[PDB]
Amino acid sequence: IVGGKVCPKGECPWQVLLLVNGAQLCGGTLINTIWVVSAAHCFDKIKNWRNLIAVLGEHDLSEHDGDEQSRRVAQVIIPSTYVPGTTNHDIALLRLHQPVVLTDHVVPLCLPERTFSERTLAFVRFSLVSGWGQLLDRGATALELMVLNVPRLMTQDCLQQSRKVGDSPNITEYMFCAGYSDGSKDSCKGDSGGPHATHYRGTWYLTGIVSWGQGCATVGHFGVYTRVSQYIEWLQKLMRSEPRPGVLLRAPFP
Amino acid sequence: ANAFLEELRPGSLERECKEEQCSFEEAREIFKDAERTKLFWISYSDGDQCASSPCQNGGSCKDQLQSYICFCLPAFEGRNCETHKDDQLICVNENGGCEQYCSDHTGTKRSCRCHEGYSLLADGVSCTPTVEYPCGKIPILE
Amino acid sequence: TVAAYNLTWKSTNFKTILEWEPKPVNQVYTVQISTKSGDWKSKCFYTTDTECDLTDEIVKDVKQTYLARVFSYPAGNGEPLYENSPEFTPYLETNLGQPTIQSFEQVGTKVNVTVEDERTLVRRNNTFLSLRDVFGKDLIYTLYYWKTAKTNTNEFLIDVDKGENYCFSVQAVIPSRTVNRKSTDSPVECM
Numbered sequence A: 001i002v003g004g005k006v007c008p009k010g011e012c013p014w015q016v017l018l019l020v021n022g023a024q025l026c027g028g029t030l031i032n033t034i035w036v037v038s039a040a041h042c043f044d045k046i047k048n049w050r051n052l053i054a055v056l057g058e059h060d061l062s063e064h065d066g067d068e069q070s071r072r073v074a075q076v077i078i079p080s081t082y083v084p085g086t087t088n089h090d091i092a093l094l095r096l097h098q099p100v101v102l103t104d105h106v107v108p109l110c111l112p113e114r115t116f117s118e119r120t121l122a123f124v125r126f127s128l129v130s131g132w133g134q135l136l137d138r139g140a141t142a143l144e145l146m147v148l149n150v151p152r153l154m155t156q157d158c159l160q161q162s163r164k165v166g167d168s169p170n171i172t173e174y175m176f177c178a179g180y181s182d183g184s185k186d187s188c189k190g191d192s193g194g195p196h197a198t199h200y201r202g203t204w205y206l207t208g209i210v211s212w213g214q215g216c217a218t219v220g221h222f223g224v225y226t227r228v229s230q231y232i233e234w235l236q237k238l239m240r241s242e243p244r245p246g247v248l249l250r251a252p253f254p
Numbered sequence B: 001a002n003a004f005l006e007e008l009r010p011g012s013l014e015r016e017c018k019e020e021q022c023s024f025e026e027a028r029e030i031f032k033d034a035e036r037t038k039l040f041w042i043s044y045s046d047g048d049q050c051a052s053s054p055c056q057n058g059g060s061c062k063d064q065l066q067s068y069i070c071f072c073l074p075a076f077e078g079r080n081c082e083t084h085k086d087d088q089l090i091c092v093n094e095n096g097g098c099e100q101y102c103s104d105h106t107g108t109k110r111s112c113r114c115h116e117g118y119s120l121l122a123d124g125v126s127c128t129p130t131v132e133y134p135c136g137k138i139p140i141l142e
Numbered sequence C: 001t002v003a004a005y006n007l008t009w010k011s012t013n014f015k016t017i018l019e020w021e022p023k024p025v026n027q028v029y030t031v032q033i034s035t036k037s038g039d040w041k042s043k044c045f046y047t048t049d050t051e052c053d054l055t056d057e058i059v060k061d062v063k064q065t066y067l068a069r070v071f072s073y074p075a076g077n078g079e080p081l082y083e084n085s086p087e088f089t090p091y092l093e094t095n096l097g098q099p100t101i102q103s104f105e106q107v108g109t110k111v112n113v114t115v116e117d118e119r120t121l122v123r124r125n126n127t128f129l130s131l132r133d134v135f136g137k138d139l140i141y142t143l144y145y146w147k148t149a150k151t152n153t154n155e156f157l158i159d160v161d162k163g164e165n166y167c168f169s170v171q172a173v174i175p176s177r178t179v180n181r182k183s184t185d186s187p188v189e190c191m
Ligand SMILES: [Ca+2]
Pocket: A058, A059, A060, A061, A062, A063, A064, A065, A068
């Protein structure tokens, strides 16, 4: 997170730190005691599928306290429409092996209904994005959880206010931009999979997933997030499906 | 406006234009200077745009030049107070006033619903948790 | 669908209506309004009109700067085609309404000309506020008589030659403005 603030301990209780072989991989969002939402591209270079860990209640990566709960990731479900190395359909639904215990420091974020999300949450100007990602484009990653307030834009405006760059990805109906174009604040590498959470009448909801961008906090550009509202039915259905042998599962979409 | 024996007296704005309807020139003979006549006639021959009572639902019209303004009662809006605010309780309108989910029912009143872990309050619009750690709430703050 | 164009703000004494083109053929419109950092509010849901009254939103804070957008939806019921409006700051852009001379009293060898309180659409505490209640010292009324007089209130105390019958006309003016400084002249009223 470039230009953000440290999220006080306990205030981003649904944030998940994903680890592979003990090394820092990506962020994620707790949606209930067993399920975590993250980004598909986070799993592009994974070879040791049995070595994926999700940590809830994390805050300071340099110190372990009694609030942290680690669980092995049983299943990683990704849309089969997603193509490694690209940006479209950047969402992953993760099944934890055993459930986390809900506490003052571990609380899930509400996955909302599609229409409520499309007609209501989408018009709430600001939302928070968090993570332990790079504090500067190509710079070092954060030791304490970072959080940033970013304003959402409809894609037509995002296209109109973004500097022209050839070879850059299309912003599809499965994505949305949020952020600032003045080079001051943005999510960054290592923040992927983290939540873009929206507060509405006293309750926080999941609206997006840190997905990609043209450099972090680059003038003339915004952060691009996964439009979670397009995936509500796909996620709900898969949370009802029975456990499979292999870790990775490429489920059909829609 | 000409009427023989009534045209024996000298010029008068009250007699020819206020009590009667005068033409541009009659008004011009009264003021003599062009710019003076100009600004009198400009409003004089404009017409009362509120004469047709365009403000509905108990609103008040205030005439302007070639137009009007409608002042509406609390429950109405629109150029002519035609819009009923009470007939706007639909989900695309500030979530129908629902705290969480809203469901449209055409012909009848919309209904409000809640996310899992919450239940609908007395008012039919607010939600309350039925579990210790409902989703979307930050405990350490409360 | 086709995108709406020529979005224009029509505002006088804070009654603010956004207008646009074209007349819809197999499409309806929905209007959204916000302040630069606030949430978007929907208005005029699936209207076939090419106008939308936004008075009730802008009168919440006449000094804020608003932006509106007109969504185009196809007949029957993926982000819609839309167009943004020019930004609009009511306090700095609303037209000053045509004033009306309430009375003129010859109090001695002087005539006092009273300007009727111009009411606006801002309705603090059940009643509609006047232009002066909203603008304060930013508003002055000017009198053109027969030559010119100006006031910080709604009254002019002018010197006149006994038994001569004068004619008066007033204009609401916000001097600090550079664009749309004044109202149209009031109807002329003579003694
Ligand atoms: Ca720690």
